[PDB]
Amino acid sequence: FRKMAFPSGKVEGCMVQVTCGTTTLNGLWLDDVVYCPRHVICTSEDMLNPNYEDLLIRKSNHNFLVQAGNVQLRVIGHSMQNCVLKLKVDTANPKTPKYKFVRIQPGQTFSVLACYNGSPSGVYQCAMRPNFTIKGSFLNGSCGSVGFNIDYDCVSFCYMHHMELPTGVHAGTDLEGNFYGPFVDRQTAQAAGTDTTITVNVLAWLYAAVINGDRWFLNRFTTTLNDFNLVAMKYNYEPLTQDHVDILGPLSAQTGIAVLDMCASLKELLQNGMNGRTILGSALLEDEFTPFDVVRQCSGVTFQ
Amino acid sequence: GFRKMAFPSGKVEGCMVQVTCGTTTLNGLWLDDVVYCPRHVICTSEDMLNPNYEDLLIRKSNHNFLVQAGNVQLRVIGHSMQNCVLKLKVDTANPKTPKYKFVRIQPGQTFSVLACYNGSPSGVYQCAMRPNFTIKGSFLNGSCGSVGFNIDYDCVSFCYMHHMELPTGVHAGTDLEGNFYGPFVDRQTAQAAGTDTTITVNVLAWLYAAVINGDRWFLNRFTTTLNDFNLVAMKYNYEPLTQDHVDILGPLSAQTGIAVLDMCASLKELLQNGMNGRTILGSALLEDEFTPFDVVRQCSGVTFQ
Ligand SMILES: *[C@H](O)[C@H](C[C@@H]1CCNC1=O)NC(=O)[C@H](CC(C)C)NC(=O)OCc1ccccc1
Ligand SMILES: *[C@H](O)[C@H](C[C@@H]1CCNC1=O)NC(=O)[C@H](CC(C)C)NC(=O)OCc1ccccc1
């Protein structure tokens, strides 16, 4: 079972660079709008506590350099929405895919197209942690790189990159510019909350193990959802929501193992450990595969 | 903790097509006016058990090949076989053909795979060519003709085309000249690989990545000679470390201030003592599928912990 990213071509065709002065970051070009982090308008001095409303009133369309490679796109309008800048340009991107902007929950996975100077560098899969941070590679110049999922022909953009926290983890916004988590776009030390294990994804991975015939951990017990949630919290596992129970439905149906029976199996693994045994060849419980990821990787779903 | 990163797949996505012969469907790679695909597309279920490919191919005409680029049929106007790959000349040039090369990769090197089904891209992930010439991929029925590649500037270097799954669940395939990596054959028979070994230079690169990310518990004050390291490495079915490998670890050694032979002494202790339930970069196992180049790409401008 490997992390698999979505094919990145539909997103590569949307990446541009945005420059104010000597500050360059990435933007997302959809139709005739370029979306990017608003801190492109900040200088070194502005960054500790920028007054973004005051910095933006001093900017005109002609102050923004938007480039698709070396090709300039003329800016014909600008506005700020939360922590994102929207630059209207005079050219509709002919590579614009069918798309949506979505706000994801903790535990949801997405692909990141890491970009520098508007040029795609790499693609990887990551998970939104319960503390609203992501673990992955973002270097200087990576801001405005996006996270996404693809369903059939349609790109759901869920993340735009803004900052690195002291622990080396990353924080950003949805494409409406609202941060995930209690973070703000200013050059100040900010701490993430204590992270927890993504319970719904551990359950998905136990279902994946059962599908592949690795089922030694199936016990003969059940639990209520409330009793499970109170025990899970003692082991720094996220409580399950009704939505989590429902998204496990397909794997529960495929395996014939009721969700609350799998919860009872996980509770015994937390209380007793694995006693030297492995699951899918791992001594560690994996929490960055969603129920969708398990079905996707076992069933060979494509996109176009 | 430290993630595998694939190359952006768009330049390859624009080359993927579907190839069908009778009821056998797989993927092809469309470059200029040629579609490259695994030759076993010409086999029925029965043929795949023990195929005489020259005999099976002479019984085929251009019209027996259905090539589809999405909805659009590409007319086949010529065919030839090069080792285990079929080359279908079509009457249309692919406008999305990138600058490209065909390369044969060395064991220990990494590449990105674009897994495809019915000519449609499904997923992208990083693989290493193992010393036993298998890859640990994710490939289902219909995945054959999926390719592996690296990208340098604008240029796609295609190194792998997918053909089969071994009984152990690992994967085997060819270069784009149709020559298998490893002692495998394109027949529906159970095939074992040679006993695999661990890619030593890649483990060392990953331990450097761990140190750069502040994960340092495994460092020690032993050093070793290269020869004495290699004696222990070989005992544990690790590949020998060459002076060329020591040289390519130079930049990571400079970044961390840990001499390559000091990192070798750390790895020797990990092999002899195990990890004792501890993790490195959140892994319970020593990872050998990042090259020094792969690590340098992610660690370049990182501030030392
Ligand atoms: C945007 O490209 C950049 C991304 C950071 C830089 C290093 N890795 C990243 O993920 N964001 C910032 O520089 C950001 C700007 C503020 C106005 C939000 N500040 C930030 O992340 O500060 C922490 C930091 C900066 C530079 C190097 C290491 C950490
Ligand atoms: C091409 O789409 C397909 C890919 C396989 C299917 C499952 N996962 C994969 O990677 N290749 C084959 O089906 C291949 C065709 C031969 C004519 C090369 N057969 C195959 O891999 O068989 C392996 C095997 C045969 C007999 C016993 C045990 C394993």
Numbering used by the authors:
A (entry chain B): 3 to 306
B (entry chain A): 2 to 306
The publication says:
The coronavirus main protease (Mpro, 3CLpro) is essential for viral polyproteins processing and maturation, therefore, it is recognized as an attractive drug target. Here we show both Boceprevir and GC376 can inhibit Mpro activity and SARS-CoV-2 in Vero cells. Additionally, the high-resolution crystal structures of SARS-CoV-2 Mpro complex with these two inhibitors are solved to figure out their mechanism of inhibition. Taken together, these data provide critical information for the optimization and design of more potent inhibitors against the emerging pathogen SARS-CoV-2.
The binding mode of GC376 with GMpro or Mpro has no obvious changes. In the Mpro-GC376 complex structure, the bisulfite group of GC376 was removed and GC376 created a covalent bond with Cys145 as aldehyde form in the complex structure. The glutamine surrogate ring of GC376 fits into the S1 pocket and has hydrogen bonding interactions with the carboxyl group of Glu166.
